[PDB]
Design a protein around this ligand. Structure first.
Ligand SMILES: c1csc(-c2ncc[nH]2)c1
Length: 284
């Protein structure tokens, strides 16, 4: 079925939970043996969220190459994404090592450091220009260059230096600051505006490594971001845009990381975002 009328048909029939459970039942199951080794227990935030072995990102290190991060490679859309958990106190150096080694331009952060009165990820970037961060375990230096605070999101320019080689690179940090502590946003308009700002920066383009996107676990909000981006790109590429099937795209993405889209409310929000976004693209 088309999307917008399938949407109304699920609303009127109140069957979002059943649609979402079908997706959960059909989703791929692949091994995640490296994630479960005892030496990696303090590298995982949640015991039930792990990268599959076949798609995990490997650190270029001979001691321990593990990070909780996955490469989502979308063949028809010609887009790739790295989805990862919010960094832990003992993985901030690994996080920036990955950014460096994978040649990423942008980092997309969809959570606040504290939500619901608990810490959801480490403070992994510097908050003042004159107070830079040094990660001694991976030999990197990170400096805040500029910060632009808007009503729904903040953009930061960061400099990452590999202290071994003295090479430097500019990284863009796109921080969506207004996702509510409970539920999903009432309108997708600010989330779509944010997605378009990431696109306009070059951070999603083929001349760079894959964008790094995270929330707390790296499957829920993060899944919503890449699902909406990929669906909109396919609708631009194909002769028949109504042939884009959001459930099939989601199942394709779940071949690369488990658990993408965590609730039926997040599924409904993803439909809403793609529907509204397809009108603004045109050509409107
Ligand atoms: C959650 C999982 S591991 C962890 C941690 N590591 C160090 C401090 N807190 C928090």
């Amino acid at each position: 079925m088309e999307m917008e009328k399938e949407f109304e048909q699920i609303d009127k029939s109140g069957s979002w939970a059943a649609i979402y459970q079908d997706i959960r039942h059909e989703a791929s199951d692949f091994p995640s043996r490296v994630a479960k080794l005892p030496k990696n227990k303090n590298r995982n935030r949640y015991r039930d969220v792990s990268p599959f072995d076949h798609s995990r990102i490997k650190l270029h290190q001979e001691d321990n190459d593990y990070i909780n991060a996955s490469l989502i490679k979308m063949e028809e859309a010609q887009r790739s994404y790295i989805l990862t958990q919010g960094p832990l106190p003992n993985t901030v150096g690994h996080f920036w090592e990955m950014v460096w080694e994978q040649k990423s331009r942008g980092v997309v952060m969809l959570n606040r450091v504290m939500e619901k009165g608990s810490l959801k990820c480490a403070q992994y970037w510097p908050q003042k220009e004159e107070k830079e961060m040094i990660f001694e375990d991976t030999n990197l230096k990170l400096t805040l260059i500029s910060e632009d605070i808007k009503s729904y999101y903040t953009v930061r320019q960061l400099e990452l230096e590999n202290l071994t080689t003295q090479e430097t690179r500019e990284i863009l940090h796109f921080h969506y600051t207004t996702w509510p502590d409970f539920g999903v946003p009432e309108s997708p308009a600010s989330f779509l505006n944010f997605l378009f700002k990431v696109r306009e920066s070059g951070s999603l383009s083929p001349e760079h490594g894959p964008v790094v996107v995270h929330c707390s676990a790296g499957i829920g909000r993060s899944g919503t971001f890449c699902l909406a981006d990929t669906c909109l790109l396919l609708m631009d590429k194909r002769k028949d845009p109504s042939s884009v099937d959001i459930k099939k795209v989601l199942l394709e993405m779940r071949k690369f990381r488990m658990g993408l889209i965590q609730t039926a409310d997040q599924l409904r929000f993803s439909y809403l975002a793609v529907i509204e976004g397809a009108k603004f693209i045109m050509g409107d």
